């Protein structure tokens, strides 16, 4: 509201997997209400996707992709959303963060155009999630 | 070469013929009346089946000019 983000950010960092799981869940709803603190502090969220000591990789990844978009890097939001696996579908369902998704078709068009030329390749420089959004579209 | 170049543009651009009066105008301003003869041509070809408003007005001061 006018409540500082600082508490949430500190929880992400902590060793215990039960704490981390709470931390993102709360972080996710407030993301629109407060970008400012969280945008520098995006680094912690990203690591949390990477750990395998943490159970909740898809949620962690989903949270970082929104903060990134907020900063105004359309590109970094993409990498993390593809990292999530599932919970890509939720970003799509929202329209004030359908941007990540719409941009994914955008990023795709570039790569596929290079592969397209001699056949109708998607080839090597595209991954599955990016490939998927486009054909669903 | 200046007069020559301007004509060929009008052919390339007639697949969006509206672009041609803008570009041909800039070139006609030049010191050489030579370029102007080509300018006239560029427009003509571009618009030749069906034209624009703009193409006709560009051509019109040159008709009056007394350089032959």
């Amino acid at each position: 509201m006018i409540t500082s983000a600082a508490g949430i950010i500190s929880l992400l960092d902590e060793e215990e997997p039960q704490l981390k799981e709470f931390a993102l869940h709360k972080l996710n709803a407030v993301v629109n209400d407060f970008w400012a603190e969280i945008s520098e502090s995006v680094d912690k969220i990203e690591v949390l996707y990477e750990d395998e000591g943490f159970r909740s990789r898809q949620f962690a990844a989903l949270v970082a992709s929104k903060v990134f978009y907020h900063l105004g890097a359309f590109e970094e939001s993409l990498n993390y959303a593809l990292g999530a696996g599932d919970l890509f579908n939720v970003n799509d369902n929202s329209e004030y963060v359908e941007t990540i998704i719409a941009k994914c078709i955008d990023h795709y068009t570039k790569q596929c155009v290079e592969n397209a030329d001699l056949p109708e390749g998607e080839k090597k420089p595209i991954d599955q999630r990016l490939e998927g959004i486009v054909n669903k579209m | 070469v200046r007069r020559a170049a301007v004509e060929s543009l009008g052919f390339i651009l007639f697949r969006t013929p509206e672009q041609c009066p803008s570009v041909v105008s800039l070139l006609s301003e030049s010191y050489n009346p030579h370029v102007r003869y080509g300018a006239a041509m560029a427009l003509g070809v571009c618009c030749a089946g069906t034209g624009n408003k703009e193409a006709i007005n560009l051509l019109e001061p040159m008709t009056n000019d007394p350089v032959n």
Binding site: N89, Y96, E98, I101, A102, K136, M137 | L26, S30, Y31
Partner: protein, 58 residues
Amino acid sequence: MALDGPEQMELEEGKAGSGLRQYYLSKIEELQLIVNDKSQNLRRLQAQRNELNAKVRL
């Protein structure tokens, strides 16, 4: 569609496809910016040139 109104699905529902239209329009919005400044910059050079032409012809 809009840049507003959340709704469920995207697989083939088609609200997402319309929603992408609103983002397709953002792309032209990115593009409208480059184009206006290119017209203004061309114009800057034309003003200078028209002024040079006038002397030589004269």
